[PDB]
Structure formats: structure tokens, C-alpha cells
Symmetry: C3
Subunit: 462 residues, 3 copies
Amino acid sequence: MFEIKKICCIGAGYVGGPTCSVIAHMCPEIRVTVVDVNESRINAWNSPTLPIYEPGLKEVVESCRGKNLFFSTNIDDAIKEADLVFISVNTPTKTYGMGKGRALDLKYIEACARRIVQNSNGYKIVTEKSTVPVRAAESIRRIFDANTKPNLNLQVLSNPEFLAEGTAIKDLKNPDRVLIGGDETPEGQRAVQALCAVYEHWVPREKILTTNTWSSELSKLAANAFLAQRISSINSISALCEATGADVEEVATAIGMDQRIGNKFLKASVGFGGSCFQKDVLNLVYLCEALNLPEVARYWQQVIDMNDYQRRRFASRIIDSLFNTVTDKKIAILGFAFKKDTGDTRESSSIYISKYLMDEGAHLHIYDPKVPREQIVVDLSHDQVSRLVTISKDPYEACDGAHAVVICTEWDMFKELDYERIHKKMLKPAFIFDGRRVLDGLHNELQTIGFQIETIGKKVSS
Amino acid sequence: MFEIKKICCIGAGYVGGPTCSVIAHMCPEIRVTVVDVNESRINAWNSPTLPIYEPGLKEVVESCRGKNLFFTNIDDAIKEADLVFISVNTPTKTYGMGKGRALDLKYIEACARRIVQNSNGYKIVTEKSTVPVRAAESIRRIFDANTKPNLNLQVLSNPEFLAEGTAIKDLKNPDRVLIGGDETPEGQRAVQALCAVYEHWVPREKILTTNTWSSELSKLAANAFLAQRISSINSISALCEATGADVEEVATAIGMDQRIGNKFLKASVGFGGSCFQKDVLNLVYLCEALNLPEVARYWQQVIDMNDYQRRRFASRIIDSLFNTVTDKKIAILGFAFKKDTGDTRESSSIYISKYLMDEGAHLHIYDPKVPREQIVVDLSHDQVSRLVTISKDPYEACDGAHAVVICTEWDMFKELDYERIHKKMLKPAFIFDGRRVLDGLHNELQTIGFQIETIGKKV
Amino acid sequence: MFEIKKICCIGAVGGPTCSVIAHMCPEIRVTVVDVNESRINAWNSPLPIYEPGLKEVVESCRGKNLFFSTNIDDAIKEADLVFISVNTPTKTYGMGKGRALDLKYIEACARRIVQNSNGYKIVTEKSTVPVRAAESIRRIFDANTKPNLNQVLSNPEFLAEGTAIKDLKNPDRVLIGGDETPEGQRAVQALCAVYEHWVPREKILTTNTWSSELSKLAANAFLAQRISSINSISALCEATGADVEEVATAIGMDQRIGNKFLKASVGFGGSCFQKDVLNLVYLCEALNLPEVARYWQQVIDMNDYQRRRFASRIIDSLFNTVTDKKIAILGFAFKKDTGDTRESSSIYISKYLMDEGAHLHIYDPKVPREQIVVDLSHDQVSRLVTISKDPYEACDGAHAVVICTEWDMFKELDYERIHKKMLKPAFIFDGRRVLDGLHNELQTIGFQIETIGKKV
Ligand code: NA
């Protein structure tokens, strides 16, 4: 049975970076070399300030940077020496041509497959670590077979990531499961056991699932679709709660206490964000349309349509409450990241709520404690930003003479604000639109102050 | 009970201007103060040259300008007045949710917030302009949120019904006076107070008291019923051209029914003005917002038929010209949306022109009252310079033209010398009567050599 | 009755047709006129268009009875027969944009003919005109009538770009349409006697004016319908395992169907097929015949489906990513042995691949270098398009080779050399069925070859 001793990982993003640091930290006898085409990333890993901030990552990196964990821009030498080659390059959504906005672009994987087969001889294991479309490993095998050399035996496996932005180290040291997919051939099983033996240094065998290559690629996309479907389902219930008088937090709790359903991912919101949910669902839909499966495509498309409906419905309540005219009205936008405790604004619901209010000619005063000022201006552009957008340094400056306060990100600080002071300098009637259910428990207090507070999944009183 | 002695009207623009002059003319004991944020308008009212030209308006203004009629101090006028009129224009939104249909309440938002600021005690607030339904709820919401001790503001609805041309006559002898207020003992007091103002010259039978919502809805529905009659008879005109019937004969037979009436049955190329399409499209948007799609698509047919009437007329011209109008000279006679005016807002001549401009035609436009600069603005978004020429007289527009198009029912177009026109027109020469003004000259024009076609008559 | 001795032709289609008339009618004076001075001077020089055997025909009569002039007024006044051979382009604006024909060049001729003419003359429309257009010409003549002024006929062309002289000397049929009046029959027999100098009487068909205008449009629609029909079968062969060339041969051996115009391809091109079919569809919509309109629209929809389907196969074989990939496009004209690229299927296959961010290396032995850049524009052309001076240069480091025109030279290329400098895997997409017979050889070399109407 083959044993893996030297590992190369193409791509030093949030995928291959943290994953390989844990491998070097739990397998001291294995030499792990993380490479990337960006020289600025390599210098950032070798600097006392890492490019990505994960809790407990500094302790893991500095414990191995020098012994068995190395970062370099010399990709050819790392590929030649390694027994296992990770492909951790980003596969962005296509923005052009057939499949624009849904299909994934494989140009960064095509380059690695052609560069791996170039600077390699003998037996090596090629494993796709990034989120790839289904049957993409067939494309990698096709490049290897067409460009075959004497004494070249490249094995192609699938081992997708499942870590979340915030608990990467905890999810890598104690993962729910490790997914490995390979061909159902004696050569493929040897490569699977080789990679499977690497994780057995700190992962039990029960939490290691071995499937075929296609089941591994499909599981990564479907897992994010199942998670996204839970949010859209509870969001669809929130719209029904607002029309029946029910409360979505009460309904989500009653649903969540069923052990077969679970209580995770049942928090209604203005809409899910991030660079993974909509990206993978839209790719899953494109896959079904390409495979003549229109019933399956329109099934999963409802997850996106529901999420778009949730955002547009929330913005319409704000405009309808403001007498269907928001021209030259000051609106405070509290929160711009797609979730709390981060500065990432990729596919954030605050972008769409802002643009919906910008289409009414509103004067938005946006505040977010961690999102940089330049990111807000870029996400709200294609001229229009300079006329309507103002970025406040604190919440109270954004609510100085504002008609309404809109909460789009569940930052904990918004719960502890002095709403007595805010109401004094707000125009009347003063509105609060809680798009994250963070003020649950302050409704009676905020109404006695003078606020008309509306929130997702609760019928408005009077 | 309560008596109104001092009146303020925010907005001096065709609506509140003439209405308050008549109130001051029939109520010498009531002080009427018209205010506006634009100083140029106020100085125009106090000058011997008024900003708007209505017949008999100078006689009413000069009789009261100084005694009880006054025209820029909005804060003091609100504090002293018992009744406050809101006569600000509410334009159609050109952006956001409801673009092209919904109305923008930003000019009413300012008045409601400025009233509640410079006001104490008991005052009556009455909306005079064309507002969307439930707009008074928005004014009440601002008053309730910004309430002061010993502040009792009453909100009423009193829409206008005057037309551009007979404003003074429609105010002295109105068909009806609409006043809407809440069905509460406090609201009824304010309604009777406003009713008592019109009783100085309007009989009580012609003063109707309804709720606030019925008054807002009646103003929109009244213009839709009028527009529906024109679109209905226009749909018949298209049917007459296919059966051989005549639309003027059918409209007469329909009009002699006492239950139907004979008013607003004149078939045309399409109705114009800033009130018909604006109020119908706003009515359709209201129904969609209230989950009433059946009602929305019902009233949308008034607009679709009017758009069909214009596009159908333009297609007849192109098909008669062998489906090619590139570099062809066409005389466009009439540009206003109706006769005896210079207003070209939503005029059917604009759409017929643009339909012919999309074929690369050389249009020579003439209108006796529409200014030359107004035609160039209405035909823009380049394209106007290459194709549009404005003639000072009809004959200059018909010098080497293939066809003559009549889009406005000007009386002078009936008396033109068509014998001279045909001699310098390219052959074959066409005449397209889009207003049924040549009824009676069909046999004469055909003997001259013209092929005359008109709305609601088989060729 | 009347005999035609002097011929005027507005528009230098009309060039080759009148040169043959002057070559077979030495006693008839043929004068070709045009408003463009550049064309007329080109005809009198040692020609603007290249047709086989045309130089021999022109030089045999240029001076005796064949003349080219820019003086249109004098030729109309003197001629007994006046041909209207002006182009009627598709409208790009207004009512009927993209489908209807523009009659401005016919309107101008009708008003200029009726101006510089007196007495009896025969007016014949030679170009492809819409139906009932002759009714419009009669209306202009009746409106601008002079004393002692008296005929409108239809005589459409049927020559193809490449065999004009052979199709004019030995035509399949001569179509002449005129009114069902004693005056119209005189004008028809007058025009009939001109073709009887070298065309038998059996191959001369006399119909009414409207049947003659519709026959020209319908004939191109029936021809286009046969290509779309065999193309729809080609898509079905790729899914069943059948072969379209075998099915087309088995169908073609039926005497009632015929074997002509049954070669499946990436899509038909030219300035006549789609132009006349789209105009035929617009005519039906204008006459409240939507069932007939959507019937003939399927010929266009199938042709667009054939092009888009072929372009999609190329991208899917290339792993659904063609960004910064070198692709060789062999052939740009709509057919072989020509340089015309009007409505060529190579334009759409290229633009489909350009929308994926591909680096196209185009080669065509006869299409000019500047024409390819124009057909691919409205900055995008400069970044993605490269024009190769010879083959192999387009396949130097290319991922796939696409054949869009049935040039005979593409069959005789050295594919062994091409594969050595191509990136692997190397693909060949035969969009014209020119490599039928080399499939086993190309696969042993290392190529994965795919073609229209054959299952992979
Ligand atoms: Na395509």
C-alpha cells in the first residue's frame, strides 16, 4: 500500500491554506508545501500577519512554518517532489457566454491539469480540493490521458472542503465528516486509501466516507443547496407569518425541536448571503438544465427565487411605510456584511436592499463596524453612489435626521444601542425595520419611546 | 358651529390659484392668502401679467387683490388660517417602484410636515390637488406622529374638476362640489365648515359630502369613465372601417339614449392631455397594489385601446405610401392634444410623428398656436435635426409632400385651399383625416385627385 | 406586335444578364446604366465582378451593342425595354425591421422612369421584390400619367453567384408575369421574343404578375426548407446513431424528392435564402395568415438551431471553457469557391466562440483579410480575433480545428503535422461533411473527430 510523504497544494486561499496547515500540524512526518500563483499571498503567509483571519490559525502556522510547512512561488518544484497534489484554485461563476451567471469557469483548473501533467513523472495523486462542477474530474482525467508520458500514472480523486468562515480550525481538527471520492477500480482504491490514511492521523475511521468521484463532486454542491433550502423555507414561512399573525421565531423553534429536522439553519433573515450558497445552487440548476432535467432545475431554482423575493419584499415594506416616496429622504443602513462578525460583503443582502432604496432616490447613510469604507462604494457601483450614498463612522451619525433605521446584519452591537437618543433626532414618524430579528424582546420598549418597529416574520400591530 | 375666517392655500399653480380667487370673490368676509415657495410666481400674480391665461381671471383677481386676496410668507399664513389648502402638483413617478404609473407624494410630504410645524390649536387641512387614494391617511399619519398639546388638525378631501379653458366658469357654476371627511363628530364639523364656504355661491344640492376615501377615488374614476367613452367609441371606429359602417352615425345613435348621453363620443386618433392617461394609469397601479388584478387589466384596456388607435392610424399612412417613407415629405397639420390650445402634453401628434420618424420620413409640422421650441423638445429623447422641419404655414409644409396628415381638429384646416396644395404635392397625394373634420368634403377632395381616408370610414 | 431593339438596365444581377442578351442578340442595343460612377467605369475597363466566362462575353460586344454608361436619363428615353435591377435591401428600421423589404430604390426608379419617358415602353422588374410591388408601380404610373403615355411586367432572376453565365445561356426556366389584359399579353410576348433568340419556348413560363413575384420568393424558401429539413435530420442522426449522409442518399434516390440540396451543414448562408424566407413570413403576418407565417419561420429557426447547436458542441467538448484558448476556424465564406461572406455560418460560429473569450485564428483562401474584421464588429475584435495567412499557422498551439466552409483544400491538409503542434486533446469539428472517409485515419493519428449528423 502506497504511503504519502510529500504534499503539494496549488492555491493558498481559505481552502488549501487552513487545510494544509492542519495537515502539517497533525502529520509531522509529512512535508506540506502550499503554493500559489499570487506572490503577495505567499509573502503574507510568511509574514507575522496572515492574509485570512481564522481563530487559532496563528498558533497552527507558526508551529509548523519551517519544519514541515512551507510556502513558496516555485510551483514546478513542489509538484515534482510531492506524492499528493491538491488543486485548491478558485472556480468563479462564468460572467459570459453559455451559462453566464450560473455555470462555473474551469480555466483555473484546466491550467493546473496541464501544468501538473507537465512537471510530473511517475506515480502521483491529484486531488481536487475546491468546489468544482460535477464530471469535472473526468475533464482532468481526459487531459492526463491525452498528454500521457511513459511511466506516468496519475490518479484523480475528489476531496472537497466543508469549513465555514469563522470556525475553520475547529472544523478541520474535529470535522463532521471527511469526503473522499475516487474511481471504483483497484488503482483508484489504492489512491483513496492513501489519502484516507493521511486523515486517520487525527480523524476516526467512522467519520471518513469513501464514495465514487461523481458522488463526491455532487455532494459538495447539494450540501450547500440543502442548507440554503432550509433558510428559504423558513423565510417563506416568515412571509406567511406576517399575513396570519404567527411568529416565525416561534414556528422555527417548534419545527427545530423535531430531531429529524434539527434546529440549525432556521433563523429567518432578509436573505442568505456569502459566495457559496447562491453560487452552488445556481450551478446545480445549470447542471440539471444541461442534463435535460428541467423538473429538477426548477425545483432548486425556487431556493434562489425565494431568497430574491425575501429581499425585494423587505425593501417594499420600507418604501410602502415611507408613503411610497423616498426621494431625498435620509435612511440609516446599519450593517453591510452578509453576516455578523466579518467584513465580507459577497452577495450580501445589504447590497440589494441598498440598491432597491437607491432606485427610489434615497439618501442612504450606511454603517458597519468592520466592513471597510472602500468596499461599500465598490459593491454599490456598476456616479450614482456619490449622490445618494454616505458612509457614517458611527451609528448615531447615520441616524441624525433619518426617517427610518434598517438593520440588515445581525451585529450584536445594534441590540445595545441607545434608542432613546436616536428617536430624539429622527423625523417623525420614526421607523425601525429589523431584518434579522435582533430586537426580539424590545418591541414594547421601542414602541413606548415612539418607534414603529417592523420585523421579518411578525404581523404589524396598531 | 365652527366658522372659517382665514384661508391659506399652499401652491399657486392653475389649481389653487383660480380656485382661491373665486372664493375671495364670493366670500368678501373671508381672508384668502395664496402662498408658494417660488417667488417668481407670486410676483406674477401681483403684476398686471398673470402667469396663467384663463378667461375672466383678471376680473376676479383685480376685484379682490388687496382686500381679502393676498399672495411668500408660508409660515405666518399657516399659523393664522383656519383652513389650509394643499394645491401642490403630484407628478407621475419616473423611477423606482411604480415608474410611469404611481404618483410621487414628495411635494405633499413637505406641505404636511410644514403645516404641522407652524400650527397650533384647531385647523382644517384640505387637499385640493389630484392625489392618489389613501393619501390623506399619510397626512394624518404625519399629524398624529408630530402631535402637540392642544392640537386638533382635521383632514379633508376637496378635489378640483376644472378644465384648461373654462376654469372660472366651472368654479362659478360647478356641476358638483366634492368634499370628503372622516365619519366622526369632529370630522363632520370640519366638513360643514368647508361646505359653508361654497354655500356663498353654490347651491347646497350640488355639494356632496362623502368620506375621505370616496372623495379621492371619485376624482380618479371620473377621468377614467370619460376616457373609457373615447376608447369605446374608438374601438367602434376600427370596427366601422372593417364593416363599412360610419362611427359618427353610430355615435349619434348611441348618444340619443338618455341613459348613455351624447357627450364624449367624438372618435379621434387618440385622447391627450395630462389628466386622462395619468389618472387611468395611476388607477391601474392602485389596483395592482391592492391585489385586484381583474380591475387593473379592466382599466388598462382604456390605455391599450388608445395606444392601438394611434399606432393603427400611423400604420395606415405607411401602408398607403407603399410601406416606405424614407426621405418622403409628410405634412403634419396640428400638434396640440386638442383644438384651441397650445398644450401638447400627451398629444397624439407626438406619437404619430415618432412612428413616422422611425421610418426615416421628412416631417413638416405646422400648428397655429404651438410654439416652435415646444415641438423640438417633445420629439427628442441626433434624430430631430435630420428629419423634423417646422413650417410657419400649411402650404409650406405641403410643398412637395406625399401626404397630408390632420391630427388636431383646428377649424382652419377645414377651410384650406386644397386645389393649390395638390398641384405642388407629389403623386399620388394622400389625405389622412385623424379627427373627422372633413365630414362633407369627401366628394370634393376626390375629384381634385386626393385619396382621402379618415377614422371610422371604410376606404 | 412590338419588337424590342434597345435595352436599358438600371443597376450594374443586371450586368451579366444583359451581357448575355447582347451576346445572343447582336441586333439589339444593350445599355447598362447605374447611378454609381465607380461601377460603370469598372465595366469599361479590362470587370468589377468575377464570373467564369464573363470577360469573353463582355469583350465580344462591348462597343458593338453592349454599352455601360452613367447617363440614365438618355438610356431610358431611347430604350424599348427598361429593366429594374436595383437592389431591395431588408429594412433595418421602422415597421418590418429585419424582415420587410425597402422599396425606396424601386420608388425612385418608378418616378424617374415615368419622368424621362414618353409613348409605349415596357417596364420589367428584374430584382427580388415583395409581392404586390408591381401594383405599387402601376399606381405611380397612373398618378403621374401624361397624354399618350402607356406596361409593368415581372421577370425575376434565378442565377447563382458562381455559374451566372452558364445559367443564363442555358436556363432551367424563364419566368415572366403580366396582367391578364390584352395589353399585358402583348408585353409578355414582346419580352418572350427576346429570350427566344437562344432559349426554347418550352422553358418559358407565362403567369400573372403576382404569381411571378411570389414564385421567386417561394422558390428560395423551398430550397432553404430542404437544407433545414436535412439539418433537422442531422440532429436526429447524432442522437440515434444514424448517419445523415446515408439518410440523405436514401431519401435522394426517390425520384419525387430528388437528391439536390440535401447536404447537411452547419447552416445555409448567402444574401438570398434567409432574406426571402423572412420576407415571406412578414408578408403572411401582414395578411393575417399566422399559421402560414410560423410554418415558414421554422426554416429560419431550424437554421439558427443548427448553428447554435454546432457551436455548443465545440464548447462542451472543450470542457465548457474556451477562455484564452486557441481555436482554428477554417473557412469563412458561406460556401466554397467564393469570397462572399454575407450571412455566412462561419460568422455566427465565430461570434458564439468569441462570446466565450476564445482566441480565434481564422483562415480562408479567398475571403479578404479586411472583410473578416468587419463582419465580426458591431475593440472586442482586436483582443480575440487573429487572421492567419495560411493554415497550420492557425493550428499552432490550438485546442481544436473547426471547418465551417466546404473548401476542397481542407480535405487535402497534412493532419499528421497539425497534431504534433496542437495541444492535447486535439479536436476536429467537421461542419460540412468534407472529411467523410478519413475518420479512421484521423483517429489513429490521435484526433477526436466529430461531425454533423454522426454520433460520436
Ligand atoms: Na451558443
